[PDB]
Design a protein around this nucleic acid. Structure first.
Ligand SMILES: [Mg+2]
Ligand SMILES: [Mg+2]
Ligand SMILES: [Mg+2]
Ligand SMILES: [Mg+2]
Ligand SMILES: [Mg+2]
Ligand SMILES: [Mg+2]
Ligand SMILES: [Mg+2]
Ligand SMILES: [Mg+2]
Ligand SMILES: [Mg+2]
Ligand SMILES: [Mg+2]
Ligand SMILES: [Mg+2]
Ligand SMILES: [Mg+2]
Ligand SMILES: [Zn+2]
Ligand SMILES: [Zn+2]
Lengths: 100, 68, 55, 96, 114
RNA sequence: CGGAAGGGCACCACCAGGAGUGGAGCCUGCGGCUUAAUUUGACCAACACGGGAAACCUCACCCGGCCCGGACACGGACAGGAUUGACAGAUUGAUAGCUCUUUCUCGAUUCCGUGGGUGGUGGUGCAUGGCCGUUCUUAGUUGGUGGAGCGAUUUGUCUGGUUAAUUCCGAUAACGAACGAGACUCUGGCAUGCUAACUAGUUACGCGACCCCGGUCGGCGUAACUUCUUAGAGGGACAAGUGGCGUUCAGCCACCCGAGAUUGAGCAAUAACAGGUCUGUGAUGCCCUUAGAUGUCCGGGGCUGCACGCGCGCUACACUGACUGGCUCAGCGUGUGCCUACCCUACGCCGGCAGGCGCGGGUAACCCGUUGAACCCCAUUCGUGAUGGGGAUCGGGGAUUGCAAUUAUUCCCCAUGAACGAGGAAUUCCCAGUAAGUGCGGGUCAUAAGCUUGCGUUGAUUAAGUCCCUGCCCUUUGUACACA
């Protein structure tokens, strides 16, 4: 009944498109839905030396990865959940469907 | 680069000519008489021989030592 | 016996146990986030991993 | 390599039942993951398929730490003639 | 999955997956005009699209080499059997791919002209 | 290019200053010395650099001892053996069958001679790729058409003004342009307007506790909502308005209204250097070694060694201070790892302490955690004394990590109590939430920050200029250099 899907991604545009597409599917099937809740973004940050050897001006990079997690709540049987989730998913977004 | 001490040679292991015939004895009747002993352990049960040394017995595979 | 001491030093910690997963190098490893790769190879494959200098 | 007959047969039968085999470049692996029941350490795997490479039976490429080996056709007929097999049965990379 | 690995090292591990896989297919398919991969990772399915120039050459006779490449990828990464499928696709306007033209120029130079 | 001239720019330059360094103790790097070895690269753009905090490993150096992990091809020895292993006793350091003696094996894998390899942190970065540093993050660079010249070339790219800027304006044989700059991306700020939320909260409501209707509660449950929290789409500032200065141009200064009237970084380029890296590599040519190995392993040692000199920093020299109680506030983050063996911790007992033993939470806006961080603030003690400043050196003990701490890994307790009284010549960095003080995360990590990379907090003096010094750039000039 109280299904809860979680969408992790590295991109922002694709993830907003996926979650908006899923709530459009839930609106078309006319379901009560909780809005797309945004978790705070994770910024994986690695600071390495640019130089392979040791000499130079001490120059550092700032490589960062961003992880965006948006999650949705729906109220439907499992068949509806499988039918909506099995369609329309962008290749970069990773999905986790929890039940309770 | 040069060395001082002479080298430690490899152990040139001694070849034994017809080692299986030294286990048994020849009789003019067709019966088998075994000279030296046998190892009783698990995977090497019934025909696996032991080493006959000057002061004790030994089998390699399971490391069995029969002291006197 | 030889195979009883051939690799018998405990590699349970320390720099000699862990290594780069591209070079098998032992110098400048990032073990943060489970990279386990040397810093030159992380600079090489950062855009392939996903780490980008947005800033 | 002083490899056992049984370990070499294990190597050749996995290589002939699937046409490829992979291996992390590690002498100091205890025991090989992709065929892990009859013992065959990764040392035995690496040096056996090095002997298979050197007389032109298998093809080798290397990505970061892993050997990847592809069995060629003259390697197929060699490994069949070694393992004493009928000419119908093939590796999985050949049949559909 | 009861191993339940964190998301931070999860995305890092997927990135290292694509990095090792990109360099592996780079050393394999450089004669074919390999330009890259895109992994469409479904749950319970995994499509992995190779983008190159000579797709017949990367596919092989009866598709043999793409079969053994699928077997190599699955056996190296420990995937379930039949979970992944490789796919050869030809890049559009292969002149405008800097990677494929660099590989072409590489094979021309080791061909030996000026 | 100049050991010429003239313009310009810059807190890696100066002026006004601030905090310093250089003086002392210690940390750590470099040279020297010493040594079995105290390996090595680098010497503005080397010197707390190689992400280099080395007990082992790392590890390349030294002293000893194992292994082949010498593929494949050829030729010999033979299931009347090719030969791998092998516990006693010697021996060794070692339970290395390494060697010596002795004998059991193992089920053609092999061994022995020869080609041929292969491996290497071995040499060469003055053979090389890639990457990086520098010139310089300065402002420099280039065609098309049109002038000049026989031509190489030149003007455009400028006398000036202005700008952070070859940024524009404006003169003008040039006119239209591209790269750089700028624009762009990430970030900080502002939205009571939008989107949304039991993994964030507020306000009410009802119980519960306590104090004398009301007050407090991160005590407990639910009705609205999104101000606070989170993050998406938008919007928002452009010198827009006013007044001066200036061809009235480019622009500059001041002020209103305003969340802001220069937020900070990333990317950064015709070119060069015989700058660095062959010790990041299964990137690599050539050379060298390749079985008594420079391959690889194991054991020990060294990389720490101390008459000296230099560099990066930490602690301080105290009363604006120290000590002891008391009160009260954060933001970055990270957290159970493929191999891979090692996670952050609440809460409860024991102990002064470091710590030890129990059950629990957490793959994380869910648990540590409302991260009760320091400095700061409040109240004592001190009293100008190398004193309760300072905490080096050194002794005795107690815990943790690890296979192992001795040359003391670290931490704790007691005692010892050194120079140091504000640092000569010289010299570093910086202008707004900046410097400086202060603590906290990350990396390295079994143990672990005197380092580096980030984060917050408390938060200024001075300046809104210049070419005087040091740098570099442009123009002109000179050249017999042009591998300059
Ligand atoms: Mg290292
Ligand atoms: Mg300056
Ligand atoms: Mg010295
Ligand atoms: Mg080591
Ligand atoms: Mg080395
Ligand atoms: Mg070896
Ligand atoms: Mg190669
Ligand atoms: Mg070795
Ligand atoms: Mg004193
Ligand atoms: Mg002492
Ligand atoms: Mg100076
Ligand atoms: Mg002259
Ligand atoms: Zn036995
Ligand atoms: Zn690497």
């Amino acid at each position: 009944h109280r299904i809860r899907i979680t969408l992790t991604s590295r991109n922002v545009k694709s993830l907003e498109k996926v979650c908006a597409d899923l709530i459009r599917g839930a609106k078309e099937k006319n379901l009560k839905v909780k809005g797309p809740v945004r978790m705070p973004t994770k910024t994986l940050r690695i600071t390495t030396r640019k130089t392979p050897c040791g000499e130079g001006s001490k120059t550092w990079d700032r490589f960062q990865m961003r992880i965006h997690k948006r999650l949705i709540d729906l109220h439907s049987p499992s068949e509806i959940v499988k039918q909506i989730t099995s369609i329309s998913i962008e290749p970069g977004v990773e999905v986790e469907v929890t039940i309770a | 680069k040069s060395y001082t001490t002479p080298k430690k040679n490899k152990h040139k292991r001694k070849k034994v000519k017809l080692a299986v015939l030294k286990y048994y004895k020849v009789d003019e009747n067709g019966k088998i008489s075994r000279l030296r002993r046998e190892c009783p352990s698990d995977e090497c049960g019934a025909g696996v021989f032991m080493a006959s040394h000057f002061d004790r017995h030994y089998c390699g595979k399971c490391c069995l030592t029969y002291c006197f | 016996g030889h195979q009883q001491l051939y690799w018998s030093h405990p590699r349970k910690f320390g720099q000699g146990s862990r290594s780069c997963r591209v070079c098998s190098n032992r110098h400048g490893l990032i073990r943060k986030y489970g990279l386990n790769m040397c810093r030159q190879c992380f600079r090489q494959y950062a855009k392939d991993i996903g780490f980008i200098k947005l800033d | 390599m002083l490899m056992p007959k049984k370990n070499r047969i294990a190597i050749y039968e996995l290589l002939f039942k699937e046409g490829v085999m992979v291996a992390k470049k590690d002498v100091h692996m205890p025991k090989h993951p992709e065929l892990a029941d009859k013992n065959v350490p990764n040392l035995h795997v690496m040096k056996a398929m090095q002997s298979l490479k050197s007389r032109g039976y298998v093809k080798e490429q290397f990505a970061w730490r892993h050997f990847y080996w592809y069995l060629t056709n003259e390697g197929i007929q060699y490994l069949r003639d070694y393992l004493h097999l009928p000419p119908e049965i093939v590796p999985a990379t050949l049949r559909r | 999955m009861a191993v339940q690995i964190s998301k931070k090292r999860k995305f890092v591990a997927d990135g290292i997956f694509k990095a090792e896989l990109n360099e592996f297919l780079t050393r394999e398919l450089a004669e074919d005009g390999y330009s890259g991969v895109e992994v469409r990772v479904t749950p319970t399915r995994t499509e992995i699209i190779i983008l190159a120039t000579r797709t017949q050459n990367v596919l092989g006779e009866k598709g043999r080499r793409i079969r053994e490449l699928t077997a190599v990828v699955q056996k190296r990464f420990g995937f379930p059997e039949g979970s992944v499928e490789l796919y050869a696709e030809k890049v559009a306007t292969r002149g405008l791919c800097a990677i494929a033209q660099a590989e072409s120029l590489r094979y021309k130079l080791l061909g030996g002209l000026a």
